[PDB]
Amino acid sequence: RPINPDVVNRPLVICGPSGTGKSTLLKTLFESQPNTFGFSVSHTTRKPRPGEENGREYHFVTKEEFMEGVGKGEFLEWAEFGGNCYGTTFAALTALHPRRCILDIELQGVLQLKAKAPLQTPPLEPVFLFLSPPSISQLKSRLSGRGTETDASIRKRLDAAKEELRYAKEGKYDVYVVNDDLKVAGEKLEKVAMGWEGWKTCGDTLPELNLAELD
C-alpha cells in the first residue's frame, strides 16, 4: 500500500520525553517502509553515543560552529535542551527530497515550527505526533536502561519532561501514541507516517501521568 499523497509533503514531527522510545520506534518504521521516509539529521552540540555516527543520527558540532550557523540563517528552528543546542537546518530537510520528511525535535522546536511553517514559501503543514510513555515509572526505567546519559543529564531530561507533558495534556498535538508494546505502537506510527485512512483517529488517550513522580 503506497504512501498517501496528501501527507508526502507534510513533515511528520515526532516529539516526546527523552527515553520514551522515539528513536527505537523510528527504526521500526524505516525497516517496515524502506526508501519511503527521510530522517532529518539535526545539528547538536552534545557528544555522540556509542551507536551514533556523525552525519547519521546528528551532525555533531561545537557550540561556536552551531551559533555561527544560527547567525548565518542556516536553521529552520533550534533550541537548547538539557544544556546542549539542537536544531534543524534547511539543508538537512532539502537532503530528504522526495521522501516524506521526519523530524525528531522537542517542544521549543514544535512551538517555533507552528509559527514558522505557515510562513514558508510554499506554506509547510507539519503533522505533530506526541509519543508518550505508558507511565512515568516506565519512562525512568527506559531512560536509565539505555545507559548512555550521566546522572546530571537524566535529571535535566526528566525535568524537561514536566513541561513537555504539561503541554501535551493541553491536547494540541495532532496524534498521540503511547509506546507500551513496541509492535502496537509501531503499527500506529506506520499508519500516521504513511497517512493511511484512519490515521487521524488511530491514536491513544494520554495516560494519567502524575508529574510529581518526575521530581
Ligand X SMILES: Nc1nc2c(ncn2[C@@H]2O[C@H](COP(=O)(O)O)[C@@H](O)[C@H]2O)c(=O)[nH]1
Query: Can you say which residues are annotated as belonging to the binding site?
Result: 19, 21-24, 42, 46, 49, 58, 77, 86, 104, 106, 146, 157, 179-180
One-letter amino acid for residue 13 of the chain: V
Provide the CA 65 distance to its chain's centre, in angstroms. Answer: 23
Q: Which does 86 bind (CB under 5 to 8 A by kind): ligand X, a copy of itself, ligand ADP, none?
A: ligand X
Binding segment for ligand ADP (CB under 6 A), chosen from 1-9, 14-22, 94-102, 169-177, is 14-22
Q: Which does 149 bind (CB under 5 to 8 A by kind): ligand ADP, a copy of itself, ligand X, none?
A: none
Residues that bind a copy of itself (CB under 8 A): 63-64, 67-73, 77, 79-80, 108, 111-117, 119, 163
Q: Which does 119 bind (CB under 5 to 8 A by kind): a copy of itself, ligand ADP, ligand X, none?
A: a copy of itself
Strand order in the sheet with 42-44: 58-60, 42-44, 84-89, 75-81
- The angle that helices 136-146 and 151-168 make with each other, rounded to 10 degrees, is 140
167 burial level (CB within 10 Å; 0-12, 13-18, 19+): middle
89 contacts 69 by C-beta, under 8 angstroms: yes
Q: Kind and range of the H or E element at 161?
A: helix 151-168
**Rule CB under 6 A: is residue 20 a binding residue for ligand ADP?**
yes
d(CA 45, CA 64): 9
**Rule CB under 6 A: is residue 79 a binding residue for ligand X?**
yes
Q: Which residues bind ligand ADP (CB under 6 A)?
A: 16, 18-24, 142, 145-146, 179, 182
Q: Which residues bind ligand X (CB under 6 A)?
A: 15, 18, 42, 46, 77, 79, 81, 86-88, 104-106, 108-109
